[PDB]
Design a protein around this ligand. Structure first.
Ligand SMILES: Nc1ncnc2c1ncn2[C@@H]1O[C@H](COP(=O)(O)OP(=O)(O)O)[C@@H](O)[C@H]1O
Ligand SMILES: Nc1ncnc2c1ncn2[C@@H]1O[C@H](COP(=O)(O)OP(=O)(O)O)[C@@H](O)[C@H]1O
Ligand SMILES: Nc1ncnc2c1ncn2[C@@H]1O[C@H](COP(=O)(O)OP(=O)(O)O)[C@@H](O)[C@H]1O
Lengths: 102, 102, 98
Protein backbone atom coordinates (compact mmCIF):
# COMPACT_ATOMS: atom_id res chain seq x y z
CA UNK A 1 0.00 0.00 0.00
CA UNK A 2 1.30 3.44 -0.74
CA UNK A 3 0.55 6.26 1.73
CA UNK A 4 -1.45 9.09 0.32
CA UNK A 5 -3.10 12.20 1.49
CA UNK A 6 -6.67 12.53 0.23
CA UNK A 7 -7.42 16.16 -0.26
CA UNK A 8 -11.13 17.03 -0.41
CA UNK A 9 -12.38 20.38 -1.77
CA UNK A 10 -16.11 21.18 -1.53
CA UNK A 11 -16.90 24.36 -3.34
CA UNK A 12 -19.01 26.14 -5.91
CA UNK A 13 -19.48 24.55 -9.23
CA UNK A 14 -18.44 27.62 -11.22
CA UNK A 15 -14.78 27.00 -9.99
CA UNK A 16 -14.62 23.54 -11.57
CA UNK A 17 -12.17 24.34 -14.37
CA UNK A 18 -10.11 26.82 -12.33
CA UNK A 19 -9.65 24.23 -9.60
CA UNK A 20 -8.92 21.44 -12.08
CA UNK A 21 -6.16 23.61 -13.56
CA UNK A 22 -4.63 24.12 -10.13
CA UNK A 23 -4.79 20.38 -9.49
CA UNK A 24 -3.05 19.68 -12.77
CA UNK A 25 -0.39 22.34 -12.11
CA UNK A 26 0.43 20.81 -8.76
CA UNK A 27 1.70 17.60 -10.31
CA UNK A 28 -1.19 15.54 -8.93
CA UNK A 29 -1.93 12.64 -11.27
CA UNK A 30 -5.66 12.92 -11.33
CA UNK A 31 -8.75 13.71 -9.41
CA UNK A 32 -12.31 12.61 -8.83
CA UNK A 33 -15.16 15.10 -8.82
CA UNK A 34 -18.86 14.84 -7.93
CA UNK A 35 -21.98 16.87 -7.73
CA UNK A 36 -23.13 17.42 -4.19
CA UNK A 37 -25.42 19.50 -2.11
CA UNK A 38 -24.56 21.39 1.02
CA UNK A 39 -25.40 23.94 3.70
CA UNK A 40 -22.87 26.21 5.41
CA UNK A 41 -22.66 29.41 7.53
CA UNK A 42 -35.10 25.55 0.92
CA UNK A 43 -31.58 25.84 2.39
CA UNK A 44 -29.37 23.35 0.53
CA UNK A 45 -27.21 24.62 -2.36
CA UNK A 46 -25.73 22.63 -5.24
CA UNK A 47 -21.96 22.41 -5.13
CA UNK A 48 -19.11 20.17 -6.22
CA UNK A 49 -16.68 18.03 -4.36
CA UNK A 50 -13.18 17.17 -5.55
CA UNK A 51 -11.05 14.34 -4.15
CA UNK A 52 -7.36 14.36 -4.99
CA UNK A 53 -4.99 11.66 -3.77
CA UNK A 54 -1.45 13.02 -3.45
CA UNK A 55 1.84 11.34 -2.80
CA UNK A 56 2.85 13.97 -0.30
CA UNK A 57 1.29 16.19 2.22
CA UNK A 58 3.07 19.20 0.69
CA UNK A 59 1.42 18.70 -2.71
CA UNK A 60 -1.96 18.48 -1.01
CA UNK A 61 -1.32 21.72 0.93
CA UNK A 62 -0.08 23.49 -2.24
CA UNK A 63 -3.34 22.77 -3.98
CA UNK A 64 -5.32 23.74 -0.89
CA UNK A 65 -3.41 26.99 -0.32
CA UNK A 66 -3.59 28.00 -3.97
CA UNK A 67 -7.34 27.34 -4.14
CA UNK A 68 -8.05 29.18 -0.90
CA UNK A 69 -5.87 32.22 -1.54
CA UNK A 70 -7.32 32.67 -4.99
CA UNK A 71 -11.00 31.91 -4.40
CA UNK A 72 -12.08 31.54 -0.81
CA UNK A 73 -12.44 35.20 -0.15
CA UNK A 74 -15.23 35.34 -2.71
CA UNK A 75 -16.62 31.78 -2.99
CA UNK A 76 -18.02 29.29 -0.48
CA UNK A 77 -15.92 26.28 0.25
CA UNK A 78 -14.14 23.96 2.63
CA UNK A 79 -10.95 21.92 2.26
CA UNK A 80 -9.91 19.07 4.34
CA UNK A 81 -7.49 16.22 4.29
CA UNK A 82 -7.78 12.48 5.21
CA UNK A 83 -5.12 9.75 5.29
CA UNK A 84 -5.43 6.98 2.81
CA UNK A 85 -3.42 4.14 1.44
CA UNK A 86 -3.50 3.39 -2.27
CA UNK A 87 -3.66 -0.29 -3.11
CA UNK A 88 -3.94 -0.10 -6.89
CA UNK A 89 -3.30 2.79 -9.14
CA UNK A 90 -1.26 2.54 -12.38
CA UNK A 91 -0.30 6.25 -12.43
CA UNK A 92 -0.23 6.90 -8.69
CA UNK A 93 2.02 3.95 -7.79
CA UNK A 94 3.90 3.55 -11.07
CA UNK A 95 4.74 0.30 -12.92
CA UNK A 96 6.10 -1.40 -9.78
CA UNK A 97 2.58 -1.23 -8.19
CA UNK A 98 1.75 0.07 -4.72
CA UNK A 99 3.54 -2.62 -2.77
CA UNK A 100 6.86 -2.98 -4.36
CA UNK A 101 9.56 -4.43 -2.14
CA UNK A 102 13.26 -3.58 -2.20
CA UNK B 1 -5.02 22.27 10.27
CA UNK B 2 -7.86 21.76 12.69
CA UNK B 3 -8.74 18.18 13.70
CA UNK B 4 -12.21 17.14 12.86
CA UNK B 5 -14.44 14.13 12.97
CA UNK B 6 -16.16 13.46 9.67
CA UNK B 7 -19.48 11.88 10.50
CA UNK B 8 -20.97 9.95 7.63
CA UNK B 9 -24.67 8.94 7.52
CA UNK B 10 -25.85 6.76 4.67
CA UNK B 11 -29.59 6.26 4.66
CA UNK B 12 -32.83 6.21 2.78
CA UNK B 13 -33.37 9.23 0.48
CA UNK B 14 -36.82 9.94 2.01
CA UNK B 15 -35.09 11.02 5.27
CA UNK B 16 -33.13 13.87 3.65
CA UNK B 17 -35.04 16.78 5.28
CA UNK B 18 -35.52 14.95 8.58
CA UNK B 19 -31.84 14.27 9.01
CA UNK B 20 -30.88 17.75 7.80
CA UNK B 21 -33.16 19.16 10.53
CA UNK B 22 -31.29 17.21 13.20
CA UNK B 23 -27.91 18.32 11.89
CA UNK B 24 -29.11 21.99 11.88
CA UNK B 25 -30.35 21.67 15.45
CA UNK B 26 -27.08 20.06 16.62
CA UNK B 27 -24.76 23.00 16.36
CA UNK B 28 -22.79 21.44 13.55
CA UNK B 29 -21.75 24.24 11.21
CA UNK B 30 -22.71 22.63 7.94
CA UNK B 31 -23.08 19.46 6.01
CA UNK B 32 -22.64 17.96 2.57
CA UNK B 33 -25.10 15.54 1.04
CA UNK B 34 -25.16 13.43 -2.04
CA UNK B 35 -27.34 11.00 -3.84
CA UNK B 36 -25.95 7.41 -3.77
CA UNK B 37 -26.91 3.81 -4.37
CA UNK B 38 -26.33 1.03 -1.96
CA UNK B 39 -27.07 -2.40 -0.67
CA UNK B 40 -27.08 -3.72 2.89
CA UNK B 41 -27.62 -7.28 4.20
CA UNK B 42 -31.06 -7.07 5.65
CA UNK B 43 -30.84 -4.67 -6.34
CA UNK B 44 -29.31 -1.25 -5.53
CA UNK B 45 -31.52 1.09 -3.39
CA UNK B 46 -31.60 4.96 -3.88
CA UNK B 47 -30.21 6.53 -0.93
CA UNK B 48 -28.35 9.56 0.37
CA UNK B 49 -25.10 10.13 2.08
CA UNK B 50 -24.44 12.99 4.53
CA UNK B 51 -20.97 14.14 5.59
CA UNK B 52 -20.78 16.38 8.62
CA UNK B 53 -17.39 17.65 9.87
CA UNK B 54 -17.55 18.33 13.58
CA UNK B 55 -15.09 20.00 15.91
CA UNK B 56 -15.42 17.33 18.56
CA UNK B 57 -16.02 13.67 18.71
CA UNK B 58 -18.85 14.26 21.26
CA UNK B 59 -20.84 16.39 18.80
CA UNK B 60 -20.45 13.70 16.11
CA UNK B 61 -21.66 11.01 18.47
CA UNK B 62 -24.60 13.14 19.65
CA UNK B 63 -25.76 13.57 16.05
CA UNK B 64 -25.22 9.94 15.36
CA UNK B 65 -27.12 8.85 18.47
CA UNK B 66 -30.01 11.15 17.77
CA UNK B 67 -30.37 10.07 14.15
CA UNK B 68 -30.01 6.42 14.95
CA UNK B 69 -32.56 6.41 17.80
CA UNK B 70 -35.01 8.56 15.89
CA UNK B 71 -34.87 6.67 12.59
CA UNK B 72 -32.65 3.61 12.38
CA UNK B 73 -34.93 1.21 14.11
CA UNK B 74 -37.53 1.95 11.38
CA UNK B 75 -35.44 2.84 8.29
CA UNK B 76 -32.25 1.44 6.75
CA UNK B 77 -29.08 3.34 7.50
CA UNK B 78 -25.49 3.21 8.69
CA UNK B 79 -23.31 5.78 10.44
CA UNK B 80 -19.57 5.90 10.65
CA UNK B 81 -16.82 8.27 11.46
CA UNK B 82 -13.43 9.13 9.83
CA UNK B 83 -10.64 11.47 11.03
CA UNK B 84 -10.00 14.53 9.01
CA UNK B 85 -8.08 17.73 9.30
CA UNK B 86 -9.64 20.92 8.02
CA UNK B 87 -7.29 23.26 6.19
CA UNK B 88 -9.74 25.94 5.14
CA UNK B 89 -13.29 26.54 6.29
CA UNK B 90 -14.76 29.96 7.19
CA UNK B 91 -17.48 28.60 9.40
CA UNK B 92 -15.72 25.44 10.70
CA UNK B 93 -12.52 27.10 11.79
CA UNK B 94 -14.08 30.43 12.72
CA UNK B 95 -12.51 33.90 12.25
CA UNK B 96 -9.10 32.54 13.64
CA UNK B 97 -8.73 30.34 10.53
CA UNK B 98 -7.57 26.70 10.82
CA UNK B 99 -4.23 27.39 12.83
CA UNK B 100 -1.88 26.62 10.02
CA UNK B 101 1.17 26.34 12.38
CA UNK B 102 -0.35 23.63 14.54
CA UNK C 1 -17.46 2.22 17.81
CA UNK C 2 -16.29 -0.70 15.74
CA UNK C 3 -13.12 -0.30 13.66
CA UNK C 4 -13.61 -0.79 9.95
CA UNK C 5 -11.63 -0.51 6.79
CA UNK C 6 -13.35 1.66 4.15
CA UNK C 7 -12.30 0.32 0.76
CA UNK C 8 -12.87 2.81 -2.07
CA UNK C 9 -12.87 1.73 -5.73
CA UNK C 10 -13.10 4.34 -8.43
CA UNK C 11 -13.48 2.86 -11.88
CA UNK C 12 -15.37 2.78 -15.20
CA UNK C 13 -19.12 2.77 -15.00
CA UNK C 14 -19.47 -0.29 -17.20
CA UNK C 15 -17.91 -2.45 -14.41
CA UNK C 16 -20.71 -1.64 -11.94
CA UNK C 17 -22.35 -5.06 -11.80
CA UNK C 18 -19.13 -6.99 -12.15
CA UNK C 19 -17.59 -5.23 -9.20
CA UNK C 20 -20.81 -5.55 -7.18
CA UNK C 21 -20.67 -9.28 -7.72
CA UNK C 22 -17.13 -9.51 -6.39
CA UNK C 23 -18.10 -7.43 -3.33
CA UNK C 24 -21.03 -9.73 -2.60
CA UNK C 25 -18.86 -12.82 -3.04
CA UNK C 26 -16.19 -11.55 -0.60
CA UNK C 27 -18.32 -11.60 2.49
CA UNK C 28 -18.75 -7.86 2.77
CA UNK C 29 -22.14 -6.97 4.20
CA UNK C 30 -22.94 -4.11 1.87
CA UNK C 31 -21.64 -1.27 -0.24
CA UNK C 32 -22.39 2.20 -1.37
CA UNK C 33 -21.95 3.37 -4.95
CA UNK C 34 -22.09 6.71 -6.63
CA UNK C 35 -21.79 8.43 -9.91
CA UNK C 36 -18.70 10.55 -10.17
CA UNK C 37 -16.42 12.14 -12.76
CA UNK C 38 -12.67 11.80 -13.00
CA UNK C 39 -9.49 12.69 -14.80
CA UNK C 40 -6.62 10.19 -14.76
CA UNK C 41 -4.22 9.37 -17.60
CA UNK C 42 -11.39 16.37 -19.65
CA UNK C 43 -13.58 14.64 -17.07
CA UNK C 44 -15.03 11.16 -17.78
CA UNK C 45 -18.12 9.75 -16.04
CA UNK C 46 -17.19 6.95 -13.72
CA UNK C 47 -18.31 5.29 -10.52
CA UNK C 48 -17.08 5.09 -6.98
CA UNK C 49 -17.74 2.26 -4.55
CA UNK C 50 -17.28 2.40 -0.82
CA UNK C 51 -17.21 -0.82 1.12
CA UNK C 52 -16.77 -1.05 4.89
CA UNK C 53 -15.23 -4.34 5.93
CA UNK C 54 -14.68 -5.78 9.35
CA UNK C 55 -11.15 -6.84 8.47
CA UNK C 56 -8.31 -5.52 6.42
CA UNK C 57 -7.86 -8.93 4.67
CA UNK C 58 -11.44 -8.80 3.32
CA UNK C 59 -10.83 -5.32 1.93
CA UNK C 60 -7.61 -6.46 0.25
CA UNK C 61 -9.26 -9.63 -1.12
CA UNK C 62 -11.89 -7.44 -2.85
CA UNK C 63 -9.23 -5.05 -4.08
CA UNK C 64 -6.97 -7.82 -5.40
CA UNK C 65 -9.79 -9.62 -7.19
CA UNK C 66 -10.99 -6.40 -8.82
CA UNK C 67 -7.50 -5.33 -9.89
CA UNK C 68 -6.44 -8.68 -11.26
CA UNK C 69 -9.67 -9.20 -13.10
CA UNK C 70 -10.12 -5.72 -14.60
CA UNK C 71 -7.27 -3.25 -14.14
CA UNK C 72 -5.22 -4.29 -17.06
CA UNK C 73 -7.99 -3.31 -19.39
CA UNK C 74 -9.96 -0.71 -17.51
CA UNK C 75 -9.12 2.55 -15.72
CA UNK C 76 -9.36 2.59 -11.97
CA UNK C 77 -7.87 3.26 -8.57
CA UNK C 78 -8.41 1.55 -5.23
CA UNK C 79 -7.57 2.94 -1.85
CA UNK C 80 -8.36 2.35 1.76
CA UNK C 81 -9.26 4.66 4.70
CA UNK C 82 -9.75 3.78 8.40
CA UNK C 83 -13.22 4.37 9.80
CA UNK C 84 -15.20 3.48 12.86
CA UNK C 85 -18.81 2.34 12.58
CA UNK C 86 -21.13 3.82 15.08
CA UNK C 87 -24.48 2.24 13.92
CA UNK C 88 -24.89 -0.64 11.54
CA UNK C 89 -27.24 -3.56 12.18
CA UNK C 90 -25.41 -6.15 10.06
CA UNK C 91 -21.95 -4.64 10.38
CA UNK C 92 -21.98 -4.60 14.19
CA UNK C 93 -24.41 -7.42 14.88
CA UNK C 94 -27.19 -7.56 17.54
CA UNK C 95 -24.95 -6.19 20.35
CA UNK C 96 -24.50 -2.87 18.43
CA UNK C 97 -21.14 -1.20 17.77
CA UNK C 98 -20.69 -0.66 21.61
N1 LIG D 1 -19.01 21.29 8.83
C1 LIG D 1 -19.13 20.86 7.56
N2 LIG D 1 -19.28 19.58 7.30
C2 LIG D 1 -19.42 19.12 6.04
N3 LIG D 1 -19.56 19.92 4.99
C3 LIG D 1 -19.46 21.25 5.15
C4 LIG D 1 -19.30 21.80 6.46
N4 LIG D 1 -19.25 23.13 6.33
C5 LIG D 1 -19.38 23.44 5.02
N5 LIG D 1 -19.49 22.31 4.32
C6 LIG D 1 -19.65 22.18 2.88
O1 LIG D 1 -18.97 23.21 2.22
C7 LIG D 1 -19.87 24.05 1.48
C8 LIG D 1 -19.49 25.48 1.65
O2 LIG D 1 -19.76 25.89 3.02
P1 LIG D 1 -19.68 27.45 3.46
O3 LIG D 1 -20.96 28.21 2.97
O4 LIG D 1 -18.41 27.87 2.80
O5 LIG D 1 -19.68 27.55 5.11
C9 LIG D 1 -21.21 23.80 2.10
O6 LIG D 1 -22.28 24.00 1.15
C10 LIG D 1 -21.09 22.35 2.47
O7 LIG D 1 -21.16 21.47 1.35
N1 LIG E 1 -20.69 -2.68 4.80
C1 LIG E 1 -21.00 -1.57 4.11
N2 LIG E 1 -20.15 -0.87 3.35
C2 LIG E 1 -20.54 0.26 2.72
N3 LIG E 1 -21.81 0.73 2.75
C3 LIG E 1 -22.73 0.08 3.43
C4 LIG E 1 -22.37 -1.14 4.15
N4 LIG E 1 -23.47 -1.62 4.77
C5 LIG E 1 -24.47 -0.75 4.46
N5 LIG E 1 -24.02 0.24 3.62
C6 LIG E 1 -24.78 1.37 3.07
O1 LIG E 1 -25.73 1.79 4.05
C7 LIG E 1 -27.07 1.64 3.48
C8 LIG E 1 -27.96 1.25 4.63
O2 LIG E 1 -27.60 -0.07 5.01
P1 LIG E 1 -28.66 -1.11 5.69
O3 LIG E 1 -29.60 -1.44 4.52
O4 LIG E 1 -29.13 -0.41 6.89
O5 LIG E 1 -27.61 -2.24 5.99
P2 LIG E 1 -27.72 -3.46 7.05
O6 LIG E 1 -29.23 -3.76 6.98
O7 LIG E 1 -26.72 -4.41 6.41
O8 LIG E 1 -27.37 -2.94 8.44
C9 LIG E 1 -26.96 0.63 2.35
O9 LIG E 1 -27.89 0.87 1.25
C10 LIG E 1 -25.57 1.01 1.84
O10 LIG E 1 -25.60 2.17 0.93
N1 LIG F 1 -4.62 10.96 -7.89
C1 LIG F 1 -5.95 10.76 -7.92
N2 LIG F 1 -6.81 11.31 -7.05
C2 LIG F 1 -8.14 11.07 -7.06
N3 LIG F 1 -8.73 10.33 -7.99
C3 LIG F 1 -7.95 9.75 -8.94
C4 LIG F 1 -6.51 9.93 -8.95
N4 LIG F 1 -6.00 9.25 -10.01
C5 LIG F 1 -7.04 8.62 -10.59
N5 LIG F 1 -8.18 8.94 -9.97
C6 LIG F 1 -9.54 8.47 -10.29
O1 LIG F 1 -9.39 7.17 -10.85
C7 LIG F 1 -9.91 7.21 -12.20
C8 LIG F 1 -9.07 6.40 -13.17
O2 LIG F 1 -7.75 6.94 -13.29
P1 LIG F 1 -6.75 6.36 -14.40
O3 LIG F 1 -7.33 6.80 -15.74
O4 LIG F 1 -6.72 4.91 -13.99
O5 LIG F 1 -5.35 7.12 -14.19
C9 LIG F 1 -9.89 8.68 -12.58
O6 LIG F 1 -10.83 8.93 -13.62
C10 LIG F 1 -10.21 9.38 -11.28
O7 LIG F 1 -11.61 9.43 -11.04
Amino acid sequence: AKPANKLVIVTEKILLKKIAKIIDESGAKGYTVMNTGGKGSSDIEANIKFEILTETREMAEEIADRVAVKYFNDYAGIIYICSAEVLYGHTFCGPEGCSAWS
